[PDB]
Copies of this chain bind each other. A is one copy, B any other.
Amino acid sequence: MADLFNKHLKKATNRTKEKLLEGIGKAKATQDEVFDQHAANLNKQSKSCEKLHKDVKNYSSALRTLLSAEKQLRDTIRDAYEPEWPDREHLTAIFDNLDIQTNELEKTVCDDLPQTVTQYVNQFPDLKKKIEKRGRKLVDYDSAKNSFNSVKASSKKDNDPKLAKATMELQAAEQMYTEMNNELLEILPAVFDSRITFFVDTLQTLFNANSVYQTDASKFHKQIVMQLDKLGESMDYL
């Protein structure tokens, strides 16, 4: 069977090459070579951002409730503690310090963090737009260039004002093309590579705030462990 069905194989592979003509659309001379690669690069910067933002916002709400629950924990232990027992003031001050630390983390992650994306995303819109800016005259340059030759090929004489018009289009499109090459060839790919800059600022902000809080939380909770040890000794007398 496999070879007879290989008539299916033979048909499929080479005849599919003709099918690719039908797949794409109506013109083929384009900005693709240099600047679609830069376009895809600058879009690859955007496409991770939207996921990161969704997760960062949802989890920032999760952190805001988490810190609120840790504030409730502290107030509840303060209030549940009662003055018959040895140390209430010291552990109360520990809880107040951990409240301060939760408020720092809450401010920094929940409120402040999103700006750290913006901190370098500021520029990316105009630059995304500018990939298209370069493209406009990468297309019109070739169109004008060929058009000039076209006229010089079609007319019995130069005098055919169309040759002048196509020259004017060629000059204008080449001027824009070259200016936009210089600006955009550096900036747009540099901005893709710099996409890591805003990712790193944001992730660093988020984790730095979390880690400073938990670093303080561990010493504060180890201090309450020492409060357990003295409470063991206290255990018989009270």
Q: Mark A16-37, 1 if CB is under 8 A from B, else 0.
A: 1000100101000000000000
Q: Which of B16, B218, B231 contacts A218 (CB 8 A)?
A: B218
* B-side contacts of A214, CB under 8 Å: 214, 217-218, 221
Interface contact B211-A221, CB-CB below 8 Å = yes
0 or 1 for each of A170-182: is its CB under 8 Å from B? (1 = yes): 0000000000000
Number of interface residues of A (CB under 8 A): 46
* CB interface residues, A 172-199, toward B, < 8 Å: 193, 196-197, 199
The stretch from A107-115, A144-152, A201-209 touching chain B is: A201-209
Point out which of A6, A25, A197, A204 has the most chain B C-beta atoms below 10 A from its C-beta. Answer: A204
Q: For the complex, what is the distance from the CA of A20 to the CA of B13, rounded to whole Å?
A: 8
Task: Give the contacting residue for A228; candidates B16, B204, B235; CB below 8 A.
Answer: B204
Question: Assuming the A-B contacts A13-B20, A62-B69, are A208 and B228 also in contact, with contact meaning beta carbons closer than 8 angstroms in the complex?
Answer: yes
Q: Which of B76, B208, B232 contacts A59 (CB 8 A)?
A: B76
B228 x A203 contact (CB < 8 A): yes
A237 to B122, CA, bound (A): 21
Nearest-neighbour CB distance to chain B for A218, whole angstroms, equals 3
Q: Which residues of B are found within 8 Å of A225, using beta-carbon distances? A: 207-208, 211
Task: Please name all residues of chain B whose beta carbon is closer than 8 Å to the beta carbon of A76 when the two chains form the complex.
Answer: 55, 59
In the assembled complex, how far is the CB of residue A207 from the closest CB belonging to chain B, in whole angstroms? 5
CB closest residue in chain B, given A212: B225
CA distance A224 to B211 in the complex (A): 8
Quote the shortest CB–CB distance from A226 to chain B (angstroms).
Answer: 10
- Across the interface, do A211 and B215 meet the contact criterion of CB distance under 8 Å? no
Q: List 8 A-B contacts (CB under 8 A).
A: A6-B23, A59-B76, A196-B236, A200-B232, A200-B235, A208-B228, A211-B222, A214-B214
